[PDB]
């Protein structure tokens, strides 16, 4: 029950790092945000879902 | 070692955005 | 003009009075004059003040046996603490004088006066249409005066810890501060020393360079009507080609230094003391090998063992 | 318990340079007024 | 372009000055700085929880946010002991996660968002000279601040209460049932003397007064916010103030400078909103605790007492200067005259002796850098430097309004028109 | 042409760093002094001269590392490496404090070389040599403090050691044994230094706040061009400002800059006179009338008497470790204290 | 304690003097153009 | 100490408080890359 | 050039490191090691007493 | 003691009121660039 939470929050850290690196780059770059606008939405939604899941699995630990 | 690696990754994440913007020649 | 109040405003804020009054001068002049006359009267005739609060007064007046160097306005009694102590809050004028009330009067009116002086410098800069940041430069000595007169007594809890209004009293304040806090090892006093030394060096350098390159129009001062040398003395890159940037640096360096030393005094008022390198070197057996910091600590201890004057 | 010539030194070393400066300034102003 | 000295007149080291006349980027910069503040709060809370040693007290571990959370009643039991650090972890996590949202908002409104707001969102745009709109924004944020104060009040009275050092037998988490809503007490606190023995607003010594004052502050802020939303500045206010972004910035700077000085004095002197079980004893508290411990060790197995300047009985010695201290461990031993010797002999409690000894061990003024010392020094320095910033920005706002902040006009220098003095 | 002429031409070449004839004295002496100071603060100990550790090798930091003065057994010896004290042994020369003498002598000659460099460069640019006369201030400071004071004292031991904490020790030692704050020449020096800092700050602020609007940019550093015949700031506005704010103001830019030159130089020379007076223990330590008043009146106390007590405490509590050669042993009973008073 | 007023008579100077001076200012304020300006500061005086 | 599950991520928590300083430095880096224009 | 520096500078840094790690600095400059501040016979601070016999006195003090 | 206190209060109130109402009298307009 603890290893699952640790893996989940490690995935959350990795996704937060990826979003921090990508989102300003995607938005500022004139080439991006047209062919890859939905990628930002999917990444942010996955980030919030990971946050909710970590909050859930914290209760059982 | 973990502290140093995390510090290195965080310190890389900042200028990495600027480098990627320069490569894509965006509004820097 | 159209109103008595308008006429009064046009005279308080007039640029034709030999010395500008201004609105800040409306608060500055009474407070500064009051503090000045009280300081003069106290420096000549004030009775001795029981600064420690243990019924042994200390004389600082010319009439009680002091000279210009040894004369001072003794800080308020330690029994007073930082309680507000005007004349009307004392039972008698004698007890007010005995507890160092004139020190509080002078300090408060002088701080109000220097704040008014900052504001009045800004006000006359605005009246003349010039830039207003001379008062920002003057904030540094005001900050230092408030730190040595108000902030340190607040942090310590008694106006008796404030700097006495004298010469020998100032030296005693410096020695006791070095004993208690080791200000010499504090990086902010080091920054202040760098600021004042650099200010002297830069004033001398700027004066030498301007006087050296005076254009022949003539005493040489009557030649005035109301970079290559520097870049060859050192390497070429180190030179202030821009006169405005050079004067900005001249204004900036000592002001920043005095700001840092005032901040250091304020921090040490709340016991954020200097660096402590005592017993930093030991041998294999564990015996302490003394350094120059150990000698400095010995001197500080020698000063401290004769400040308590009690248990 | 102060000294005695002490007063003589203080008073004269104050006055001798003061009267010299005042005399020099008065002479300069006299020249300026005479020429003008 | 608007992002260079050629098109703006501002160099890179003054580059944020280019944000004065563009609203969207200014809003983004402010939201990004808010995200930075929330990120620091969350990260430092996590850092402090991660370094918290259960046996040591909070003030012996160099912690400054955990005492703030403990004063609110979270994770603290009777006597100031810390039960669990999980609510502190939750606070840190919530702040550090909301920081991501705030940072994204700042980045969006700064980089890709519109530079100006009034052409696309007229409800949010402004000119720095439309007094009605600026007062409306001021009123909205005033309502927000009042609701925050009322949220603190609700935490005090409904959601678990707040820690009280003045509870009998040591501090405890108590619900503030009846706060002081009487305007006389609040006005006397606001109008009290700031000198020794009175202390102005720093001397509030009970939680009921704190909760009542925060009730008054919240409702007053809500009323003033609605007022400034529904009104325009009067003729006396319009002719007295400079109406520009830099002037408003200078006003905020002097306000926060005064607030920083007040907070430094609060951390140094107040032991009610800053409990000594979390922040450590104050300097006067440490000195009086050492004197009281010596008095107790003299009574067991008079020396140690003297009379105050007003005649009351106080502790003797170098502490005499700290006779204005009021601490929970010494109040039961103090009577109308002053400290009572027989009451100290008989009505003393072991927990008072333990508190006195542990406060004697750790002295800010000296009997270990107290967290009170760090807070006081830091916020006093911040207050001073922000007074400097207020002076700079106010002078430059005045000069820029008049049109001479770039230098004197050679064509028409004012001094040359004035007759010589 | 003649060898001299060709050597003079080569030394006067416009290179990145002017060498000149004065360089032949300045560069080696200054380089050796700086390198010797670094070597002493990095490797050389003070264990056999002061009973102290003063090297990075011994564990000291930047503040506590110093090139300590020679042992009090050496006297005012030149401490030549080939001299009778060291006899060519580098290790014994470093142990006896000979590196301090090396640094002091080569640094004095480096200061002389730098003053000559200022003179030379002023003669080539064609300007009046008001530098190397300003530098006479620092030269007098160094000569009085590091050379004349130990020469007047017992040995080089009582000179300042070349370190931060060593300089702080020297300050407190001089205060304890001489009451140098009470010295009027030191007071004039303090006035000169503080007035020079005041002049620098006030002149910088006055010039920055009286500039002419010579540019359309808010940042006004660009509005000054390097070859500007016109003045960049209004002297009349600055004069009016200070005339009506302070009551008096400068009207001559020349005089103002000469005054900004004169104040620190005069302060340094007065302080040098005071230190020369201290060199022979001819100090303004005490006021005889105040001492007589305090002797016949135990209830008479001023801050001067408190300063005297503080100096006595400094001397008594620092003599044992500051002068280990004297073998001072002071019992706790004779050590002054506030309670003992 | 409020404003250090221990004797009611102290309130007479504290209130009458600010009012009287305001009365002098009232005349300056009434002789002015108190219409709104849309600028950084009001040059009408 | 941290809750035991999250105790593994301590090395991130031990560097996170200083991140805003880097932000300031990052700003300078941007002004460096842009050529302090 | 850069190539040269890429060899000279690290070699010089390693030489500076070995000047301390091998104990040559103590021998060259006479700085006492942490285990030889006080000898068994001399537990006091060693101080030179005569200027003209300083070399012999230091040889006697540093012999042990 | 009361009479000195009332005199000081009168003087301080007068000067503070003069300062406050003087800086309320459109002080920004008192600049040489004002038309
Ligand atoms: C304006 C005038 C400025 C000077 C007035 C005095 C400032 C001062 O002594 O402030 C101290 C007061 C607090 O006063 C203390 O307040 C204390 C309250 O504690 C009491 O109440 C507590 C409640 O927990 C405890 O019970 C405690 O035991 C009990 O003693 C005590 O009453 C002390 O006696 C009393 O001294 O802070 C305050 O009122 C808030 C005011 C903060 C002023 C900050 C300093 C002024 C600015 C300097 C700027 C310098 C740099 C710029 C230069 C240009
Ligand atoms: C600005 C322009 C200059 C620019 C900077 C220049 C820097 C370069 C030069 C700096 C160093 C100069 C050499 C100093 C060496 C010295 O002083 O060496 C000192 C020697 C004397 O040595 C001392 O002599 C003293 C007296 O001894 C005599 O008396 C003793 C009594 O017991 C014994 O009998 C003993 O045997 C007997 O010799 C003590 O013994 C001391 O221990 C011993 O160190 O004089 C001598 O070599 C020669 C003495 C002749 C005078 C020459 C120097 C004059 C300078 C001022 C000197 C101090 C005066 C007071 C200043 C305040
Ligand atoms: C916290 C302080 C702060 C803030 C909020 C801002 C904000 C801003 N500045 Mg200022 N500035 C600052 C400090 C700050 N600055 C300092 C210290 C300096 C001196 C070096 C400057 C000097 C300066 C100049 C000279 C200029 C600005 C400008 C700007 C604006 C746009 C910048 C731009 O074009 O980005 C371009 C930068 C990039 C594309 C690279 C950085 C990309 C992002 C921002 C990195 C963020 C990392 C983060 C982890 C991402 C989170 C992602 C999220 C999903 C979680 C913006 C409103 C400009 C402006 O708009 O003027 C009109 C301008 O001309 N600033
Ligand atoms: C408190 C500061 C602040 C302010 C004043 C604004 C103001 C604005 N934002 Mg920004 N924003 C902020 C914080 C802020 N935002 C933050 C923290 C985020 C991150 C979530 C965003 C993310 C964001 C996006 C992504 C967008 C805006 C947009 C807008 C504009 C339309 C919003 C509106 O009408 O509200 C309507 C009311 C609500 C949305 C409230 C609903 C929830 C309760 C407006 C100028 C939009 C725009 O185009 O303007 C630039 C837009 O697309 N904002
Ligand atoms: C951050 C909050 C904030 C801000 C920026 C403003 C800003 C403004 N208000 Mg608003 N206001 C606010 C909160 C705020 N108000 C609240 C909470 C209320 C409810 C009470 C009001 C009620 C209000 C009214 C009724 C009026 C204003 C007016 C004004 C304008 C001029 C104010 C002035 O000159 O001060 C003048 C300040 C004083 C005369 C000082 C009074 C101080 C009192 C006596 C307390 C003293 C405390 C202490 C002893 C001294 C301070 C010490 C310090 C360390 C705390 C200005 C636009 C006026 C205007 O033109 O708008 C229409 C106006 O008529 N405000
Ligand atoms: C909320 C507070 C606030 C706000 C919004 C502003 C906003 C502004 N100020 Mg003001 N200012 C303030 C507070 C504030 N200031 C305070 C408190 C001071 C006193 C110190 C000043 C002093 C000041 C001056 C003297 C000037 C401004 C200027 C400016 C403008 C440009 C700022 C810029 O580009 O920064 C650029 C940012 C930098 C160059 C970075 C500076 C970094 C500092 C020196 C380091 C300090 C230590 C650091 C915090 C520790 C981190 C360690 C790290 C280095 C490793 C802008 C309108 C300038 C201007 O154009 O006027 C309109 C100007 O000349 N301000
Ligand atoms: C500008 C160059 C310069 C100057 C002015 C000095 C000056 C000095 N050095 Mg330094 N030195 C220099 C270069 C210089 N040195 C260089 C390049 C080295 C590296 C080799 C050294 C290494 C060095 C050491 C190691 C020591 C000195 C010492 C001294 C001092 C004693 C000089 C002495 O009596 O020697 C005597 C010799 C001469 C003066 C040479 C003169 C030759 C004459 C003029 C030619 C005629 C000879 C004659 C015909 C033959 C008989 C003196 C202050 C000593 C000292 O005081 O330290 C405490 C010391 O120990 N120097
Ligand atoms: C504008 C420039 C003004 C310059 C003068 C300002 C005031 C200087 C200080 C005067 C002072 O300290 O007097 C001390 C006395 C009280 O002394 C007290 O007087 C008491 C007796 S009684 O109250 O006066 O009846 C008694 O306690 C004792 O004599 C003594 O302590 O205060 C006064 O009586 C002054 C009242 C008039 C003030 C005019 C101003
Ligand atoms: C904790 C957290 C939560 C979990 C998720 C997470 C994403 C992993 C994480 C978030 C992390 C975040 C928000 C990470 C963001 C991290 C950032 C903003 C890192 C920026 C680094 C930039 C540096 C160090 C610049 C150095 C420049 C220097 C020293 C020189 C500058 C010089 C230049 C060139 C110009 C001249 C001047 C000077 C100053 C001399
Ligand atoms: C769940 C979990 C369990 C426990 C462990 C755990 C991992 C800690 C936790 C995770 C929590 C998590 C995942 C927390 C999430 C943390 C994150 C990713 C926080 C990031 C915030 C971004 C900010 C403040 C950036 C603002 C941008 C700015 C200031 C840019 C400004 C710029 C402008 C505009 C323009 C140029 C100038 C500059 C200044 C460069
Ligand atoms: C990090 C840091 C923070 C703040 C900023 C900062 C200060 C810039 C920075 C510091 C950086 C640092 C740490 C900078 C430090 C750099 C260092 C340690 C430079 C050392 C240079 C040594 C020299 C020149 C010795 C030469 C020897 C000679 C001449 C021999 C002389 C000989 C002697 C002994 C006598 C006998 C004869 C001979 C043989 C002639
Ligand atoms: Cl004690
Ligand atoms: Cl003393
Ligand atoms: Fe100049
Ligand atoms: Mn003290
Ligand atoms: Mn002491």
DSSP sequence for G7-43: SGGGHHHHHHHHHHHHHHHHHHHHTS--S---SSS--
Q: Please choose, from the candidates E374, E394, E392, E387, the residue with its C-alpha nearest in 3D space to the C-alpha of residue E256.
A: E387
The token pair that represents E54 in the structure block? 């259960």
Quote the CA–CA distance of C238 and C246 in Å, as a whole number.
Answer: 12
Phi, psi values for residue F233, rounded to 5°: -140, 155
Question: E358-368 burial string, b = 16+ CB within 10 Å, else e?
Answer: bbbebbbbeee
CA angle E162, E164, E166 (to 5 degrees): 160
Quote the CA–CA distance of A11 and I45 in Å, as a whole number.
Answer: 63
Quote the CA–CA distance of C175 and E19 in Å, as a whole number.
Answer: 50
Q: Please choose, from the candidates E172, E156, E153, the residue with its C-alpha nearest in 3D space to the C-alpha of residue E164.
A: E172
Compute, in degrees rounded to 10, the torsion defined by CA atoms E39, E42, E47, E52.
160
Quote the CA–CA distance of E103 and A20 in Å, as a whole number.
Answer: 10
Query: C164, C286 in Cβ contact below 8 A?
Result: no
State how far residue B7 is from chain H, nearest Cα, in angstroms. 6
Contacting residues of C for G4, CB less than 8 Å apart: 84
CA E257 to chain centre: 10
Count CB pairs under 8 A between chains C and I.
13
Quote the CA–CA distance of F252 and F235 in Å, as a whole number.
Answer: 9
H helices, E strands: number in chain E: 15, 4
Phi, psi values for residue F226, rounded to 5°: -60, -40
Query: E153, E160 in Cβ contact below 8 A?
Result: no
Q: Tokens 């004893």: give the residue.
A: E281
Could J29 and G41 be called an inter-chain contact, meaning their C-beta atoms sit closer than 8 Å?
A: yes
Contacting residues of I for F39, CB less than 8 Å apart: 29
Quote the CA–CA distance of C112 and C100 in Å, as a whole number.
Answer: 19
Portion 20-49 of A in contact with B at CB < 8 A: 20-21, 24-25, 28-32
Select the residue of H10, H19, H31 nearest E50 (Cβ to Cβ): H10
Residues in chain E: 421
Quote the CA–CA distance of I27 and F89 in Å, as a whole number.
Answer: 12
DSSP letter at C147 equals I
- The DSSP H or E segment spanning E313 is strand E313-315
Quote the CA–CA distance of C20 and F246 in Å, as a whole number.
Answer: 9
The token pair that represents E312 in the structure block? 């009351």
Query: C259, F244 in Cβ contact below 8 A?
Result: no
Phi, psi values for residue E77, rounded to 5°: -105, -165
Which three-class secondary structure state does DSSP give residue E9? Answer: coil
* Partner chains of A (3+ C-beta pairs under 8 Å): B, E, H
Contacting residues of I for C282, CB less than 8 Å apart: 34
> What resolution does the deposited structure have, in angstroms?
2.2
H36 part of contact set with chain B, CB < 8 Å = no
**Maximum pairwise Cα distance, chain J:** 51
Query: F63, C293 in Cβ contact below 8 A?
Result: yes
Quote the CA–CA distance of C208 and C214 in Å, as a whole number.
Answer: 10
Q: Please choose, from the candidates C58, C298, C311, the residue with its C-alpha nearest in 3D space to the C-alpha of residue C179.
A: C298
The token pair that represents C46 in the structure block? 């004030």
Q: Please tell me the residue having the least CA distance from ligand 5 atom 31.
A: E237
This entry's atomic model was obtained through cryo-EM
Neighbours of E181 (CB within 10 A): 14
Q: Please choose, from the candidates E125, E398, E392, E127, the residue with its C-alpha nearest in 3D space to the C-alpha of residue E241.
A: E398
Query: F54, F65 in Cβ contact below 8 A?
Result: yes
Q: Is the CB of H33 under 6 A from ligand 9?
A: no
Long-range contacts of D13-20 (CB under 8 A, 24+ apart): none
Reduced 3-state DSSP string for chain F: CCHHHHHHHHHCCCCCCCCHHHHHHHHHHHHHHHHHHHHHHHCCCECCCCCECCCCCCCCCCCCCEECCCCCCCCCCCCCCCCCCCCCCHHHHHHCCHHHHHHHHHHHHHHHHHHHHHHHHHHHHCCCCCCCCCCHHHHHHHHHHHHHHHHHCCCHHHCCCEEHHHHHHHHHHHHHHHCHHHCHHHHHHHHHHHHHHHHHHHHHHHHHCCEECCCCCCCCCCCCCCCCCCCCECHHHHHHHHHHHCCCCCCCHHHHHHHHHHHHHHHHHHHHHHHHHHHCCCCCCCCHHHHHHHHCCCCCCCHHHHHHHHHHHHHHHHHHHHCHHHCCCCCCCCCCCCCCC
Angle separating helix axes H19-33 and B2-24, nearest 10 degrees: 30
CA distances from E150 to E180, E214, E344 (A): 14, 7, 41
Select the residue of F247, F255, F299 nearest C19 (Cβ to Cβ): F247
Neighbouring-strand partners of residue E408: F212
Which three-class secondary structure state does DSSP give residue E13? Answer: helix
Query: E106, E33 in Cβ contact below 8 A?
Result: yes
Quote the CA–CA distance of F302 and E211 in Å, as a whole number.
Answer: 51
Quote the CA–CA distance of I57 and F87 in Å, as a whole number.
Answer: 13
- The DSSP H or E segment spanning C288 is strand C288-289
Neighbouring-strand partners of residue E76: E82
């Amino acid at each position: 029950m603890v290893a699952i939470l640790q893996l989940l929050v490690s995935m959350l850290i990795l996704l937060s790092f990826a979003l921090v690196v990508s989102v300003p780059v995607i938005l500022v770059s004139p080439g991006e945000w047209e062919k890859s606008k939905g990628l930002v939405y999917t990444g942010a939604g996955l980030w919030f879902g990971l946050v909710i899941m970590t909050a859930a699995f914290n209760s059982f630990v | 070692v973990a502290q140093l690696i995390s510090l290195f990754l965080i310190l890389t994440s900042g200028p990495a955005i600027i480098v990627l913007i320069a490569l894509r020649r965006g509004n820097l | 003009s159209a109103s008595l109040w308008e006429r009064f405003c046009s005279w308080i804020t007039s640029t034709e009075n030999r010395l500008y009054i201004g609105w800040f001068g409306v608060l500055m002049i009474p407070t500064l004059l009051t503090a000045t006359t009280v300081y003069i009267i106290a420096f000549i005739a004030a009775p001795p003040v029981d600064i420690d609060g243990i019924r042994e007064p200390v004389a600082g007046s010319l009439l009680y046996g002091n000279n210009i160097i040894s004369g001072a306005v003794i800080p308020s009694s330690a029994s007073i603490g930082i309680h507000f102590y005007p004349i009307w809050e004392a039972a008698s004028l004698d007890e007010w004088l005995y507890n160092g009330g004139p020190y509080q009067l002078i300090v408060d009116h002088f701080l109000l006066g220097v704040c008014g002086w900052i504001g009045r410098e800004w006000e006359f800069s605005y009246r003349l249409g010039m830039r207003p940041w001379i008062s920002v430069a003057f904030t540094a000595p005001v900050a230092a005066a408030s730190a040595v007169f108000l902030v340190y007594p607040i942090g310590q809890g008694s106006f008796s810890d404030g700097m006495p209004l004298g010469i020998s009293g100032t030296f005693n304040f410096m020695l006791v501060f070095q004993a208690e806090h080791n200000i010499l090892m504090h990086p902010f006093h080091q920054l202040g020393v760098a600021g004042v030394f650099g200010g002297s060096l830069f004033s001398a350098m700027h004066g030498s360079l301007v006087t050296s390159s005076l254009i022949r129009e003539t005493s040489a001062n009557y030649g005035y009507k109301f970079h290559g040398y520097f870049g060859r003395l050192i390497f070429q890159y180190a030179s202030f080609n821009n006169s405005r940037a050079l004067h900005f640096f001249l204004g900036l360096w000592p002001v920043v230094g005095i700001w840092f030393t005032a901040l250091g005094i304020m921090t040490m008022a709340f016991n954020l003391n200097g660096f402590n390198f005592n017993q930093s070197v030991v041998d294999s057996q564990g015996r302490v090998i003394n350094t120059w910091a150990d000698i400095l600590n010995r001197a500080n201890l020698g000063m401290e063992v004769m400040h308590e004057r009690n248990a | 318990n102060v000294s005695v010539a002490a007063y003589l030194a203080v008073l004269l070393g104050t006055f001798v340079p003061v009267v010299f400066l005042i005399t020099l300034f008065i002479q300069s102003e006299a020249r300026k007024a005479a020429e003008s | 372009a608007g992002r260079d000295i050629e098109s703006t007149g501002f160099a890179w080291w003054s580059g944020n000055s280019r944000l004065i006349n563009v609203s969207g980027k200014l809003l983004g910069a402010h939201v990004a700085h808010a995200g930075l503040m929330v990120f620091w709060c969350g990260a430092m809370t996590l850092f402090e929880v991660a370094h918290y040693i259960p046996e040591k007290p909070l003030y012996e571990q160099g912690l400054i946010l955990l005492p703030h959370l403990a004063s609110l009643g979270w994770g603290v039991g009777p006597g100031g002991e810390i039960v669990d650090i999980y609510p502190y972890f939750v606070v840190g996590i919530l702040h550090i996660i909301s920081s991501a949202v705030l940072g994204f908002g700042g980045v969006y409104h700064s980089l890709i968002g519109p530079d100006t707001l009034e052409e696309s969102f007229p409800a949010f745009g402004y000119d720095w000279r439309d007094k009605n709109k600026i007062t409306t924004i001021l009123g909205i944020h005033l309502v927000i601040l009042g609701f925050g104060a009322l949220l603190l009040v609700v935490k005090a009275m409904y959601l678990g209460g707040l820690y009280d050092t003045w509870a009998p037998g040591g501090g405890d988490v108590r619900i503030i049932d009846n706060p002081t809503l009487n305007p006389a007490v609040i006005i006397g606190y606001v109008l009290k003397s700031p000198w020794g023995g009175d202390g102005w607003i720093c001397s509030v010594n009970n939680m009921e007064d704190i909760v009542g004052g925060h009730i008054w502050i919240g409702f007053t802020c809500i009323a003033g916010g609605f007022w400034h939303i529904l009104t325009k500045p009067f003729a006396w206010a319009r002719r007295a103030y400079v109406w520009s972004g830099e002037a408003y910035l200078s006003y905020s700077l002097v306000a926060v400078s005064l607030m920083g000085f007040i907070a430094s004095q609060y951390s140094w002197y107040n032991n009610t909103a800053y409990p000594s079980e979390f922040y450590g004893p104050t300097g006067p508290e440490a000195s009086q605790s050492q004197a009281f411990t010596f008095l107790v060790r003299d009574q067991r197995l008079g020396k140690y007492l003297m009379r105050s300047p007003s005649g009351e009985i106080i502790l003797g010695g170098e502490t005499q200067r700290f006779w204005d201290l009021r601490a929970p461990w010494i109040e039961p031993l103090r009577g109308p005259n002053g400290l009572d010797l027989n009451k100290i002999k008989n009505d003393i409690q072991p927990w008072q002796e333990r508190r006195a000894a542990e406060y004697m061990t750790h002295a800010p003024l000296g009997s270990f850098v107290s967290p009170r010392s760090w807070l006081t020094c830091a916020h006093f320095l911040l207050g001073f430097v922000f007074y400097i910033g207020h002076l700079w920005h106010a002078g430059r706002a005045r000069a820029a309004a008049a049109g001479f902040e770039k230098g004197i006009n050679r064509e028409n220098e004012p001094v040359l028109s004035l007759r010589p003095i | 042409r003649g060898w001299f002429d060709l050597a003079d031409d080569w030394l006067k070449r416009d290179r990145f760093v002017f060498v000149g004839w004065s360089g032949l004295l300045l560069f080696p002496t200054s380089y050796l002094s700086i390198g010797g100071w670094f070597t002493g603060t990095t490797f050389v100990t003070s264990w056999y001269t002061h009973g102290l550790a003063s090297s990075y090798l011994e564990g000291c930091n930047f503040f506590t590392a110093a090139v300590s003065t020679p042992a009090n057994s050496m006297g005012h010896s030149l401490l030549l490496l080939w001299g009778p004290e060291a006899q060519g042994d580098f290790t014994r020369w470093c142990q006896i404090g000979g590196l301090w003498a090396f640094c002091a002598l080569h640094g004095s000659f480096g200061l002389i070389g730098f003053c000559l460099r200022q003179f030379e460069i002023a003669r080539l640019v064609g300007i009046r040599p008001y530098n190397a006369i300003a530098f006479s201030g620092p030269i007098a400071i160094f000569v009085s403090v590091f050379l004349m004071y130990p020469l007047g004292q017992a040995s080089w031991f009582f000179a300042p050691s070349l370190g931060v904490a060593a300089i702080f020790r020297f300050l407190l030692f001089i205060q304890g044994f001489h009451n140098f704050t009470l010295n009027p020449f030191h007071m004039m020096g303090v006035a000169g230094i503080l007035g020079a800092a005041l002049l620098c700050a006030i002149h910088g602020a006055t010039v920055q706040n009286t500039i002419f609007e010579d540019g359309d940019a808010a940042n006004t550093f660009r509005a000054f061009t390097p070859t500007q015949a016109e003045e960049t700031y209004s002297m009349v506005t600055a004069n009016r400002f200070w005339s009506q704010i302070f009551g008096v103001a400068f009207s001559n830019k020349r005089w103002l800059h000469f005054f900004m030159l004169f104040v620190p130089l005069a302060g340094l020379w007065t302080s040098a006179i005071g230190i020369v007076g201290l060199a022979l223990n001819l100090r303004a330590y005490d006021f005889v009338s105040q001492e007589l008043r305090a002797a016949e009146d135990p209830e008479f106390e001023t801050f001067y008497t408190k300063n005297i007590l503080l100096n006595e405490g400094i001397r008594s509590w620092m003599a044992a470790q500051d002068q280990p050669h004297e073998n001072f042993i002071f019992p706790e009973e004779v050590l002054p204290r506030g309670n003992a008073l | 304690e409020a404003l250090g007023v221990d004797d009611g008579r102290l309130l007479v100077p504290l209130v009458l003097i600010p009012v009287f001076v305001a009365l002098l200012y009232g005349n300056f304020a009434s002789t002015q153009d108190n219409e709104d300006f849309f600028d950084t500061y009001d040059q009408r005086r | 100490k941290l809750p035991e599950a999250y105790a593994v991520f301590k090395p991130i928590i031990d560097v996170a408080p200083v991140i805003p300083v880097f932000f300031l430095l990052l700003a300078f880096v941007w002004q460096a890359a842009v050529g302090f224009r | 050039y850069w190539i040269i520096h890429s060899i000279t500078i690290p070699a010089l840094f390693v030489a500076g490191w070995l000047f301390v790690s091998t104990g040559l600095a103590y021998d060259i400059f006479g700085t006492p090691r942490p285990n030889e501040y006080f000898t068994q016979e001399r537990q006091q601070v060693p101080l030179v007493n005569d200027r003209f016999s300083a070399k012999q006195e230091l040889e006697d003090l540093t012999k042990g | 003691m009361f009479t000195l206190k009332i005199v000081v209060y009168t003087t301080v109130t007068l000067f503070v009121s003069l300062f406050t109402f003087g800086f309320l009298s459109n002080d920004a307009s008192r600049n040489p660039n004002r038309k």
